[PDB]
Write a protein that binds this ligand. Structure first.
Ligand SMILES: Cc1nc(=O)c2cc(CN(C)c3ccc(C(=O)N[C@@H](CCC(=O)O)C(=O)O)s3)ccc2[nH]1
Ligand SMILES: Cc1nc(=O)c2cc(CN(C)c3ccc(C(=O)N[C@@H](CCC(=O)O)C(=O)O)s3)ccc2[nH]1
Ligand SMILES: O=c1ccn([C@H]2C[C@H](O)[C@@H](COP(=O)(O)O)O2)c(=O)[nH]1
Ligand SMILES: O=c1ccn([C@H]2C[C@H](O)[C@@H](COP(=O)(O)O)O2)c(=O)[nH]1
Lengths: 278, 286
């Protein structure tokens, strides 16, 4: 019965107390461990939006709807006051290259720019996953992969979220994410919520109930200048997770809109300032 | 410090007790999401001891991957038959590969590791200079930028899976350097706990030993992450017998000479000392 958020807190504590101090691409220096795994229940409307520091729910949901549209145009997020892709995007202003939206919907197609019509090009992995869940739920290849060795050099930033896999049992849809690089302080809470939300959406349109989100980490790290803030965060007790309901019968994965999500009872501790490494 | 092999034994035990019973025609008992960690340090090599594992098959299959080969006949010539089932002309014709010759597994590991993105023709084609040589890329990044968080080799290729005799169970692996030590994490989407997993552990441990050697590092950990981790129902009696066996200290592995490039290893370069396993247990492949 231990709150699932303690998996996240325990890993931060372990990284700071036992991790490897190294340099890194950004020049900030990090403290890191290699290889971790967390499991978050998604059952009975439970939505694992972390509570010991406020997470950017609106950014999570808008970014994911943008992925689902297949968009690689950061201007569509900026227009919605979502600036999480700003650092890496000024090729035309806003064109992120063949990032998630494109890999999920067009893996293997040649990329031109964010305005190109890629209909019928590449593998639409997202629809492939939905079809397999509906038609052959015991399949062990229900995978969506964003790590494309051909395209990584054209991407504004190599994907941290290399691939995810789905699994069906007990009337439940589960999802596992392989995240190669995990900034425990800033990105990880958002990343948990992203793939928990994707699982809620796919479960909804496949007539399944959400089960578990399994979060596997490669290089799991704390930036050296985050330790003071995270030591303060570790003093905070998690609060019960919010609940998530989808307010209408959405027929297909592409039909979701932001207002379809009813997030109830989110009561996080206040935000903590933490500068993002560049 | 408990023997690392107990992670495998404990997971088999857990799956058989609480795993999900689901539906080939053989039943599976499965869990989703698991992770084991095997130390590779101080010459220790995690070749499981509660059932004799096919070490020579592990090493020859891995050398075959590294050559970029997708031709199962090259394994057969060395009396390694682990891919025979998936490459008979009859199997391939059954899968719809009517123009494919016996032995041709399609664009599987050797090809994805050395030529990701190239068009696949057949197993005899000269692919030199085509596609992404991910294996050499990893070696170069380890040498030149060891703190890089993108040291990845990916065999999961959505474009090519329809041409493969079997989609890769070993989707991708990632490397990590700290304190002079090279670690490796494998994401395995599908794990036959009884038959494939022991062999798969030894494969990626050996790969880590080889890459560490040619990058002048020491092996650290092998982290084995599983997606659908399952026990086939007709393995349960055999695995119940294995669970009563106590692990013995793992063997040691040394590389007998200085090998400069990953492509230069031969089986005789490996010295596996002290492997004293319990006997094989028959488990029929689904
Ligand atoms: C070093 C680094 N760490 C990261 O975690 C990271 C994450 C993203 C993308 N991403 C997945 C993000 C999620 C949340 C973000 C953010 O800036 N949130 C702040 C402020 C909230 C807001 O932007 O309004 C926060 O909530 O802490 S950015 C891009 C570059 C990165 N760079
Ligand atoms: C259902 C299935 N499970 C697997 O684990 C599997 C593994 C491979 C390839 N592979 C990675 C293998 C490793 C070991 C193997 C095997 O057949 N083992 C023998 C014992 C070793 C020997 O051949 O001497 C066995 O127990 O039958 S096969 C191919 C198809 C598969 N199919
Ligand atoms: O969704 C995201 C995007 C990025 N990062 C973090 C991980 C690293 O700290 C940095 C990306 O840098 P590289 O791993 O690519 O160097 O941002 C995340 O945690 N989650
Ligand atoms: O090296 C390998 C190759 C295959 N498998 C097992 C996993 C599954 O039981 C089966 C592959 O079947 P699918 O998951 O593709 O259905 O073989 C392994 O465990 N290891």
């Amino acid at each position: 019965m231990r709150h699932d958020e303690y998996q996240y807190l325990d890993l931060i504590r372990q990284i700071m107390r036992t991790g490897n101090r190294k340099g890194d691409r950004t020049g900030t220096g990090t403290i890191s461990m290699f290889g971790a795994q967390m499991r978050y229940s998604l059952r009975d409307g439970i939505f694992p939006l972390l509570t010991t520091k406020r997470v950017f729910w609106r950014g999570v949901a808008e970014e994911l709807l943008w992925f689902v549209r297949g968009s690689t145009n950061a201007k569509e997020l900026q227009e919605k006051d979502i600036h999480i892709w700003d650092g890496n995007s000024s090729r035309e202003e806003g064109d992120l290259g063949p990032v998630y939206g494109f890999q999920w919907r067009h893996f293997g197609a040649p990329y031109a720019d964010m305005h190109t019509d890629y209909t019928g090009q590449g593998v639409d992995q997202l629809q492939q996953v939905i079809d397999t869940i509906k038609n052959n739920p015991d399949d062990r290849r229900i995978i969506m992969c964003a790590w494309n060795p051909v395209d990584v050099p054209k991407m504004a930033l190599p994907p941290c979220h290399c691939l995810c896999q789905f699994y069906v049992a007990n009337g439940e849809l589960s999802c596992q994410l392989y995240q190669r690089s995990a900034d425990m302080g800033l990105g990880v809470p958002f990343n948990i919520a992203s793939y928990a939300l994707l699982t809620y959406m796919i479960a909804h349109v496949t007539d399944l109930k959400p089960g578990d989100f399994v979060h596997t980490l490669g290089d799991a790290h704390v930036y050296s200048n985050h330790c003071e803030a995270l030591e303060e965060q570790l003093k905070r007790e998690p609060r019960p997770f919010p609940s998530l309901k989808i307010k209408r019968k959405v027929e297909n994965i592409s039909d979701f809109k932001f207002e379809d999500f009813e997030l109830d009872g989110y009561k996080p501790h206040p935000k903590i300032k933490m500068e993002m490494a560049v």
